[model samples]
Target: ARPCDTCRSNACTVYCHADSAYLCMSCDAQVHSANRVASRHKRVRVCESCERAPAAFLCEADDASLCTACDSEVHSANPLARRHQRVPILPIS
Candidate 1:
């Protein structure tokens, strides 16, 4: 499993580009809260399907959570699946 870079106890939830760390909810909250400057760091929720990249959206109809590549790979026919509701994901940190 891909554990959080800072706290190995939990699975990674988000990725920080500046820190190069995959952080869970609690760990991120703590680490990112270090200072107002730390707030400048940007992150995104990790891709649900691939588990290696940031997610593009969370599909409502098909219960899919992944990036654009996954949709291309998983849903070969984009015209059909693209019609599904695509909700943008967010970072809690």
Candidate 2:
């Protein structure tokens, strides 16, 4: 599980591409919305599976973000699972 890189308290809910930081929902809004440049930073929700780590990839079929470990386990579970369309998550910045 990954905690917010900023607060180190709550579980990370978003990944900030510009700063390479993982932040909780409140932190993400508070930090990124602080300024125009900061708001422009790309961000995505944290991994849906663990809800504690930054999302590394998005599975289109499942419509969820999966952390590295979760991605490996989920995609490797079966032949059907292997067919899920997944793409590396790109941060806004």
Candidate 3:
């Protein structure tokens, strides 16, 4: 997983396009929320597996943000897992 640019200790939860940096949720909220002008920068969640592409969905049951391919592959592994609730991940801008 990509580490947060600021903390360097935590895995990134989101990628900020404006900042061109991967950031953990806490750093994101702290940095963006502290500045009125920065809060609108486009940010998207990273995949819990690859941490490359932006996340496509959040699996509430599994507590993971996954890309489309990862989501399909993982959720399809078992019948019970197929029913995991998933919510679409929208860019945080």
Error of 1 at 65 (Å): 3.0
Error of 1 at 81 (Å): 2.9
Distance from true location, Cα of 16 in model 1, Å: 1.5
What does the lDDT read for residue 18 in candidate 3?
84
Model 2, span 1-93: residue lDDT tens: 688888867877788767888888888888978888887888877889988767888988988888899999999999999999889987664
Candidate 3 deviation (Cα RMSD): 3.2
Q: What is the lDDT of residue 84 in candidate 2?
A: 90
Better of 2 and 3 by TM-score: 2
Q: Per-model C-alpha lDDT, please?
A: 0.78, 0.84, 0.87
Instruction: Give per-model TM-scores.
Output: 0.71, 0.73, 0.61
| Model number with the top lDDT | 3
Task: Flag the better candidate by lDDT, 1 or 2.
Answer: 2
In model 1, where is the ten-residue run with the lowest total lDDT? 84-93
Model 2 TM-score, 2 decimals: 0.73
